[PDB]
Design a protein around this ligand. Structure first.
Ligand SMILES: Nc1ncnc2c1ncn2[C@@H]1O[C@H](CSCC[C@H](N)C(=O)O)[C@@H](O)[C@H]1O
Ligand SMILES: Nc1ncnc2c1ncn2[C@@H]1O[C@H](CSCC[C@H](N)C(=O)O)[C@@H](O)[C@H]1O
Lengths: 265, 265
């Protein structure tokens, strides 16, 4: 009669909250999806072992299309767990699954977990200063999305930071790198020529948040465009005007050039 | 010889990540602070028990003026852990404490936890649609902070949601409620009169995120300002231009007036 949306964390199988782990163990069935995002620091098996129960993976279609046929039915007569990377209702369309639960007379509860949306706070950039967020999608066929470009422009204009989620082909297990995102923007800049993203623009790259050894680097596009930030997942941030304090943190902890202390403050 | 920054979560002691717990367990000394936020579902005793360590709680001044005197020193001889509500680097200036740890010669690591910043997802509002954030500060005497008003304004202008962190005075055990926040905003409406916040404005309130039954309400200032939302902590949200899908979740789960469904395109 109960369905729990349990967050799985950022990186590995230990980023789940204690609350989420116990509740999962008590559930009769445990489903999980791994398309919205991917747990780079662990494996389906490791996760299974930790929780103890056996996890049934759902595809994008299984969820978006037949969640009410695969999951909800059991949730009627039992206690079901739905596991998703990061935080349950973040950056995903899962929030509407709660509406379906209600429609089927099923109670749903949310168990949160760290999100990349809030873990960027490790970059020293002030959470309160983040403006509208966006996704840098891969150009395909005749489709070449460039909206993120504008999102970055409206935020910088008002002195806010822009968080750019990078593209992901969960299926193909293919991650978009910070470099590839920096490349695309340069092309969008070259087409729109608004002076929003250029070799002189300051950027921050957060790689593998959640890990004890994440990669936090700040620098000018021309200098980071070809730097190796390690294995995915990646996150690109185009900061607005920096606080002296924000800036010091990027220099002292993300190896930012001293130049930002005078040019970007 | 290191320093760990561990998040405790949103509501009770089980909101810490397994990663965080297992690390806190194997630490020599465990500091903390409960002034940046309020965990409405636990006690220092329950945390200590779960951690199996004695937690010395520091004050803002202890931290802001003596961290390198009370904490870092031990960090050179032992593994120290500094716990905090929710995520330690969200809506706090703790990130600066890392610069200290460094100049003191002390490696530091960050372990995240669910944060109110990403927990707003449960409201049904898209995470990427949130623009700049702000805090509604308690007036102190003849001083009346108004900043947050312009933040709301600036965001609604761009059709983005606004996350309003409510003030806290842990020392006095004062926890601004969503009602108090609304009341203050109305007064600021008279001051600046910009048609930013009025009896007819739609607002969303999230109370006690992290609990299995948080209070999620959406409605018009006039109908909510007098409504009881339960014990703090509270968070107030001023949505921008809704999506039909956001409107549905608000109506179906937040209990918003069905009229909001008919969006004005
Ligand atoms: N640990 C991590 N480090 C850096 N980026 C990450 C990451 N985890 C996820 N991401 C970013 O977030 C995107 C997933 S979109 C969904 C976000 C997820 N629900 C959450 O709450 O975290 C990935 O494509 C990548 O751009
Ligand atoms: N569990 C919770 N439920 C509702 N609001 C919360 C909350 N936790 C924090 N808040 C809001 O955020 C304010 C504290 S600011 C600190 C936030 C914390 N660092 C985090 O990561 O979440 C509170 O006064 C309240 O306005």
């Amino acid at each position: 009669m109960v369905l729990y949306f349990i967050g799985l964390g950022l990186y590995d199988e230990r980023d789940i909250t204690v609350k989420g782990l116990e509740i999962a163990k008590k559930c009769d069935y445990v489903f999980a999806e791994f398309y919205t995002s991917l747990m780079a620091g662990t494996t389906l098996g490791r996760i299974q072992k930790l929780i103890g129960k056996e996890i049934r993976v759902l595809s994008r279609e299984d969820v978006e299309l037949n969640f009410e046929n695969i999951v909800l039915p059991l949730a009627k007569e039992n206690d079901v767990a739905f596991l998703t990377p990061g935080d349950p209702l973040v950056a995903t369309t899962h929030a509407e699954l709660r509406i379906r639960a209600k429609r089927a007379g099923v109670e749903s509860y949310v168990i949160h977990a760290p999100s990349i949306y809030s873990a960027v706070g490790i970059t020293g950039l002030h959470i309160m200063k983040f403006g509208k967020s966006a996704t840098v999608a891969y150009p395909e066929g005749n489709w070449f999305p460039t909206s993120y470009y504008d999102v970055i422009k409206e935020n910088a204009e008002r002195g806010l930071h822009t968080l750019l989620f990078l593209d992901i082909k969960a299926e193909k297990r293919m991650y978009m790198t910070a470099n590839e995102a920096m490349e695309l923007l340069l092309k969008v800049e070259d087409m729109k020529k608004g002076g929003v993203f250029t070799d002189d623009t300051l950027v921050v790259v957060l790689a593998r948040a959640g890990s004890l050894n994440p990669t936090i680097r700040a620098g000018y596009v021309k200098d980071l465009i070809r730097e190796d930030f390690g294995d995915p997942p990646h996150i690109l941030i185009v900061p607005g005007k920096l606080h002296i304090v924000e800036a010091e943190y990027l220099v002292e902890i993300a190896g930012a050039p001293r130049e930002i202390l005078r040019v970007n403050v």
